[PDB]
């Protein structure tokens, strides 16, 4: 299927994630005389690419373009989680997970932002001798 | 704990309850035809979720909004490019029609001094009225609609007859499906898949009685958001269709008189054999076993062996007190009072038929419906009914219902009541052992 | 000698002048409803450090585009409504003279007419109230004064225009500087700006002669012009404070709604309950003596001591032109200010006209109908400017007279844009590094 | 802080580029017949997405995609400045410094270009070993 | 040990068809729809090694150059005014002073009972109209569309003058054009080359006759779809063009009357001095050796020792039986019968003048032409026209050539057949030496 | 020019794949009010834009995404078209060869998104 139950064993369901991303993209005088309807039709298509493209520039911003999996550099706090690892891989479900962190959402974005930068920027003195 | 890392991922399959606007897919001169351009799917593939529970709530659902909304806007655009009667309302001269009278004051012999190709001219013409569509100067009559409201033709050529709507979902939404053959208005259902469109459904506009809708799979079920609130209404799904018979039984023919240049409009002319009064056969016994399966439903929240009551409704509009019918083009008002005439614990339905037609309660807007040449029968599968309850009863073994009525979201929101919208979100977050 | 290489950034802090469009936003009535999505709470103004740029008002795109946007906003919610073209029919009239005061001469008058009824077959007699501005004399026949040019509209009795704060909000990629620099002159430099989202909300006043309901002028009188040796110009003035003005339409009006041949109902102006009274507006005489005083020192500062300042109590052009205009309750207004400006520098009654049948700025082709409004009219507005023009080119540099009016809503409402310009984000730099690929 | 520090030192400015450039992608219903303002609104959406997609194409072919900072092997031209590192980059702001070689624009965009296209063409021959 | 690459930015394409939008130089309607102005320096790229087909009988910019200007056209008379209180019965008398001997009673004198602006005024005027477009009840006139439909007024403020516009294509199109000679409009040609936009093209629009077109290389050449099909049009671009001189020669009047609250109509007032008819004047010799010129590539398609007859074509709507056009705003149908009357193996021709037109030949809406002051004249270049063959039988000695076209997409054909618009596609793959 | 040697051989018509690529993206009040025309011609911009998008996605899946020209790992398998390297690059024009090959576009394209997802997968097998 498309989307799996996501219940459980996401590690097997990240086998996927190719063709869920794929999926995000792809009458003349019928709809053309209509104007309201043209441009309900017309409002979707845009907000369909800004969402495509947000999610896109966030990965490249945080240094995670291109993978589907990213290991990053910024370490778990334990505000965001304090149950151990043993209970998140199996015994979480990722949309029960979602609820949970809710609150530390863009605290996660923000230092993914900053680490990266960080790296750039020391980047640019390894080539400098 | 001191090993974690954060770890990120994209394309994740999961979800948050959404609303976006639905794409409008059919198969197969034809309004919705135009319309609903995109082709459906010949194979939609539905995915079953095992590890899935989720709430539906056919009462909160957005896709009934959106089919409203959409069906009243065709509406409309289909009547605006149509001939305006304005001309029409003028004194209308009226005799009775005692011409091969029935013997079932119905209609009306009408005449009018129309303007002609030329603004100098007039020519007094002649229509057959019904009296559902004239009102009385205090021979003096005049149209109802002029008293109030503007008034459109309908186009000859334009038809509406239902063809099934597909609607399917924006690339990044899914539409989720509940299969539980017995879910209730509201609920963590287990029985949960995803599609790409919905199973088509036909627009069909009715009251009181739900006709070529979807049949309970199981058994016949009610649904409300409220059941024990009396000011909401009863929705009642059946297992098995019941047919009924309906007829515009008298064959006549129109005319087409010029008001303007290019502009024509279409009227009743006379009848062409005897008159007899239109109605609808629904079979006797059918009915009387199918209500009495609601009954034993009902049971089950108004008391093991309370007492159930079916009466008519109280009155009103046309709209709220008989069944409404769109047959051909032609608008039926049938009484359905002794449908609904016995206590628990071939029947003929004479119908009224008139052209002046309001939509969606919206007070102006008119249209005119012009005549069907010859006869018309029209044969249909009753799904369901809306029942209302009544309210101010204080003796608890006695409950009455009566047919029930109102805006035509809930004919829809009955159809669409299995399916829900969702938004995707490709992104979330994990602790992990790895890092850069 | 370094042998510096070309790097590039992205998301490098700078801009350039640029034009877009502009989204509206506030916090039954038009602006509100058109304006859907909700303003920021609390705008999180950037001030920029070390940054000056320039700003110049006269040049400023967004006045053209608050007015026209405005307008076609005034358009749209005419566009459902019914039409007065049945009205244009010949009058029989008197002039009223039940119970009426010295000043309103004829101003009243009664006039009746064969309209058309429920069917459009038969005929109706009936009479109603007009101001005198509006009928004119066939060659005691009748008609109203734009039978001739153009069809009237009746406006929805339902819409309201009551003039609400609309903010105007950049879109992603545009930024909107704001000159925060106290008494900035309009056009030259300012270092003290800051960067917004969204500009202070203004409210779509329409007036003439005076501005009213706008800002505390930086808290001193301030005259700003595109070209100051140009009499031919018009003089934009803050003020210091505002000076309170106290208006009414003190008649006690029938609103008389009658039935015509399409579904669409027309609003009559029925008989008037109690007499009959002029329109007028009161102003402290203390107050508008000493701001006065204030704009006469800032002329001075412009043109010299050795003069003397006089204000035109007169002007030509048309009733738009020569008489302020006010719109409290949807009710047009048309008030006498000649009294205001007697002048000559080294409280007042203002009687005030109504006027029924609108034209609309800078346009002809269209006409609008104000339904009556039943009951009285009262309303206080701060006035808050002027709009003058001197009657220059005279070799008498002795003295020189400052007329009121002039008016046209783009100057009006580049009051209050003029804090504002707009510039693009331009993300990509390049520079000179140590490093290279 | 989208535009903070506009007039910050050019070196210093290169600490709020995550900023700048992640904030550049940001009763409705009721106004659908509203034609003319509904229009110009969706083309703003549209025009936004398509300067984004432009510039993001450029650094595609010039090289050092999805970087927030990054260079190429091209040098910096007498034409375009002569003046020392210590006072550019550092010691003015980027609003008067961009100014200064506001020419040479699309020179050095041409550059980049050929640059990374030549890079390419090798980078193939190499892998045909 | 060959592996896929995959190429982007590829330098080739397929057909596609896009919609194009256009530029102009710089209250004309055509100027006002082309807000874009042209590159002054447009670059023509030459594709070394490129031969490709066109096809211009199958080009879709004949469909979009159409849709186009018939949409424009009815929007620019959207605004104005509607003549409908002018359809009311006239009064009509014979203009008999200052006649001349050739128009034999075309010009007409009405009077009629109309609006003013008061509803309970009215006005007595009169005014002029040519036979053409007024029809006798059973004294009693009518104008001719009063019963098929509304007319309106152009305004008399609008220029319809014909601008040559160019059409660009979109990002992601290019327009492919044959620079080749004398090339056949089907089929391959090794002279491509590409471009921005196209030069720029009036939108003329004539029937039988072709003006300020292409002067076909300096040869004739002979273009069809199916050249053997007799039912086909045969398209001629002539070798060099034949000028035309045609005049409206009364001296004319414009009255100004009132109908309502900003609404005007514009009449036509008295002729001063004589009234004479319109006529075009062609030069003979020209004319009788552009056909001779036409003969010889006709006979080298249909025998070279065959007879070629050139004739006036057949009855049906003035509108298609003449060489109808547009000069100075008035419209012309000026008789052919005097240019093709001659055998192979300074000339005059009268022309009408009519107010009331179906502008493209649709039914259902009408316009009505204002009144031009004084005198007027244009001067033309004829650059082609449109032929029929007569056939009905099989015989190889002779056949007759006949004026045809009245379709204005076949004007528009000929004056695009030099290119077509194709969509690049950066895309592709290829074989390397070498894996990742 | 932009399609300028189109009709070249392949060999040399690759050196110029950047130009034609950065060209792909390249009283209007009064075109305010043309509410087919407005719709007709912004439908067009969405179009250009999902279009660009679409095949840079597909690059993204397929691997490579960010460069003018890669090779993957997805083999020739010489039933597409048989001939040889020497007439391909030499002598082929881009145009001819892409007419030549058009049947196994979507072939290529399934394969293509296969290895790259393989290649992933086997990466993480490291940590
Ligand atoms: C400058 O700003 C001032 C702000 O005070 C503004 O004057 C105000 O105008 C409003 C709108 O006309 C007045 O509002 C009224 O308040 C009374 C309170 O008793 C209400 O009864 C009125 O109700 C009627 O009108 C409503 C219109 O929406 C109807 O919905 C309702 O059913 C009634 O018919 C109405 O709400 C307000 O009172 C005045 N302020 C003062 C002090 O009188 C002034 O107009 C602005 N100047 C300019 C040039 O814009
Ligand atoms: C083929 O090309 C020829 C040459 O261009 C073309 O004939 C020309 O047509 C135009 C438009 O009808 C003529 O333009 C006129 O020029 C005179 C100059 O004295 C003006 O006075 C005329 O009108 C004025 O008054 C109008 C009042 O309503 C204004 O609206 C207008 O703007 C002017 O002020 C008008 O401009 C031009 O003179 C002729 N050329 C010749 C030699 O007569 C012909 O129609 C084209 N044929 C086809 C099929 O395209
Ligand atoms: C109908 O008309 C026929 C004559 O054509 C007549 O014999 C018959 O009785 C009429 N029916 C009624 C109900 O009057
Ligand atoms: C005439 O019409 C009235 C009103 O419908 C009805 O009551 C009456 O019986 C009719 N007369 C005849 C002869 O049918
Ligand atoms: C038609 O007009 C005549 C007057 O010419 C009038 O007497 C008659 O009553 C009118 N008839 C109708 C049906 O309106
Ligand atoms: C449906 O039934 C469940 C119990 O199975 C109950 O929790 C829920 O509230 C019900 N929903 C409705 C329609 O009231
Ligand atoms: C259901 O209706 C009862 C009245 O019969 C009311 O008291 C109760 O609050 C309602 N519950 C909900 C969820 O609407
Ligand atoms: C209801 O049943 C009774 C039985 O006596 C019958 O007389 C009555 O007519 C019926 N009513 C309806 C509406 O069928
Ligand atoms: C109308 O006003 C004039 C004053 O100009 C007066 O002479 C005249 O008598 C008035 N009309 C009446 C009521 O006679
Ligand atoms: C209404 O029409 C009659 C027609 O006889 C005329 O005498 C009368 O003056 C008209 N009334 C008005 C107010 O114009
Ligand atoms: C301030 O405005 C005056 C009047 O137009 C002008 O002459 C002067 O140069 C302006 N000041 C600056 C700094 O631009
Ligand atoms: C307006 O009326 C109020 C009544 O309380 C009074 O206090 C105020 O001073 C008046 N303002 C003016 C300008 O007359
Ligand atoms: C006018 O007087 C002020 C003192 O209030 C002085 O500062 C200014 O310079 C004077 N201006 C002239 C024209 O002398
Ligand atoms: C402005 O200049 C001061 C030194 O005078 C410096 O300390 C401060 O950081 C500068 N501001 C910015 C934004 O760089
Ligand atoms: C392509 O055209 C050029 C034109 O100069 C010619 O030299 C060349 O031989 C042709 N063929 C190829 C393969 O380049
Ligand atoms: C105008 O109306 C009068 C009405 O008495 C009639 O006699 C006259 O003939 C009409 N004239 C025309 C030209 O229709
Ligand atoms: C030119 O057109 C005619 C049209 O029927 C066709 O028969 C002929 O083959 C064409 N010439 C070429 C070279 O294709
Ligand atoms: C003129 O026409 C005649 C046929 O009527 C023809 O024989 C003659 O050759 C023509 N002259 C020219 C120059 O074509
Ligand atoms: C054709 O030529 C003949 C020559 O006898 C002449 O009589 C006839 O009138 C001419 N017809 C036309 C239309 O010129
Ligand atoms: C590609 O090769 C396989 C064998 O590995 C073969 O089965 C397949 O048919 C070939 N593809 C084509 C287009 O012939």
Redesign the interface.
């Known amino acids: 299927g498309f989307l799996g139950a996501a219940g459980s064993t996401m590690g097997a369901a990240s086998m996927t994630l190719t063709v869920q991303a794929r999926n995000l993209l792809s009458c003349q005088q019928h709809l053309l005389k209509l104007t309201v309807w043209g441009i309900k039709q017309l409002q979707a298509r845009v907000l369909a690419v800004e969402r495509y493209l947000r999610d896109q520039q966030l990965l490249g911003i945080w240094g995670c373009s291109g993978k589907l999996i990213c290991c990053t550099n910024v370490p778990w706090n334990s505000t965001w989680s304090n149950r151990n690892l043993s209970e998140i891989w199996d015994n979480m479900t990722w949309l029960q997970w979602d609820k949970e962190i809710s609150n530390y959402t863009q605290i996660i974005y923000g230092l993914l932002e900053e680490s990266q930068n960080q790296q750039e920027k020391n980047e640019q003195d390894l080539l400098a001798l | 704990?001191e090993n974690?890392?954060?770890?990120?991922?994209?394309?994740?399959?999961?979800?948050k309850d959404a609303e976006?606007?639905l794409?409008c897919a059919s198969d197969a001169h034809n309004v919705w035809a135009?319309?609903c351009?995109?082709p459906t799917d010949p194979n939609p593939?539905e995915?079953?979720?095992?590890?899935?529970t989720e709430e539906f709530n056919m009462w909160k659902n957005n896709m009934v909004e959106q089919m409203h909304?959409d069906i009243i806007?065709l509406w409309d655009?289909s009547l605006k490019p149509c001939v305006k009667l304005?001309?029409l309302?003028?004194?209308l001269q009226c005799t009775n029609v005692t011409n091969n009278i029935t013997d079932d004051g119905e209609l009306k012999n009408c005449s009018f001094n129309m303007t002609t190709?030329?603004?100098?001219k007039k020519q007094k013409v002649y229509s057959l009225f019904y009296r559902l569509d004239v009102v009385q100067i205090n021979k003096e009559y005049?149209l109802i609609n002029?008293?109030?409201?503007?008034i459109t033709q309908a186009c000859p050529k334009v038809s509406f007859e239902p063809i099934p709507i597909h609607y399917c979902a924006?690339?990044?939404f899914?539409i989720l499906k509940c299969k539980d053959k017995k879910f209730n208005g509201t609920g963590p259902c287990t029985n949960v898949s995803?599609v790409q469109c919905t199973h088509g459904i036909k627009p069909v506009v009715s009251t009181q009685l739900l006709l070529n809708g979807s049949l309970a799979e199981e058994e016949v079920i009610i649904r409300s958001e409220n059941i024990t609130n009396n000011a909401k209404n009863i929705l009642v799904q059946l297992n098995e269709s019941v047919q009924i018979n309906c007829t515009r039984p008298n064959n006549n023919t129109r005319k087409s008189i010029?008001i303007?240049?290019?502009q024509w409009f279409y009227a009743t002319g006379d009848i062409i054999g005897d008159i007899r009064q239109a109605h609808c056969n629904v079979s006797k016994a059918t009915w009387n076993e199918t209500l009495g399966k609601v009954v034993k439903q009902l049971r089950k929240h108004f008391g093991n062996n309370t007492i159930i009551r079916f009466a008519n409704s109280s009155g009103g509009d046309l709209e709220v007190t008989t069944h409404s019918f769109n047959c051909g083009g032609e608008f039926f008002y049938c009484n359905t009072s002794g449908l609904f005439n016995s206590t628990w614990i071939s029947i003929t339905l004479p119908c009224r038929i008139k052209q002046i037609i309001n939509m969606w309660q919206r007070i102006?807007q008119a249209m005119y419906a012009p005549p069907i040449q010859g006869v018309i029968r029209c044969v249909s599968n009753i799904t369901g009914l809306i029942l209302t309850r009544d309210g101010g009863s204080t003796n608890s073994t006695t409950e009455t219902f009566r047919p029930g009525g109102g805006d035509m979201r809930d004919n829809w929101r009955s159809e669409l009541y299995k399916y829900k919208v969702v938004k995707?979100?490709?992104?979330?977050?994990?602790?992990?052992?790895?890092?850069?």
């Open positions: 704990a974690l890392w954060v770890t990120v991922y994209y394309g994740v399959p999961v979800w976006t606007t794409f135009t319309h351009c995109v593939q995915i079953h979720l095992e590890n899935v909304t806007s655009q304005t001309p309302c003028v004194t190709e030329l603004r100098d005049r002029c008293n109030t409201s503007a924006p690339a990044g899914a995803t010029r303007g240049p290019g102006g995707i979100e490709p992104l979330g977050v994990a602790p992990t052992r790895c890092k850069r």
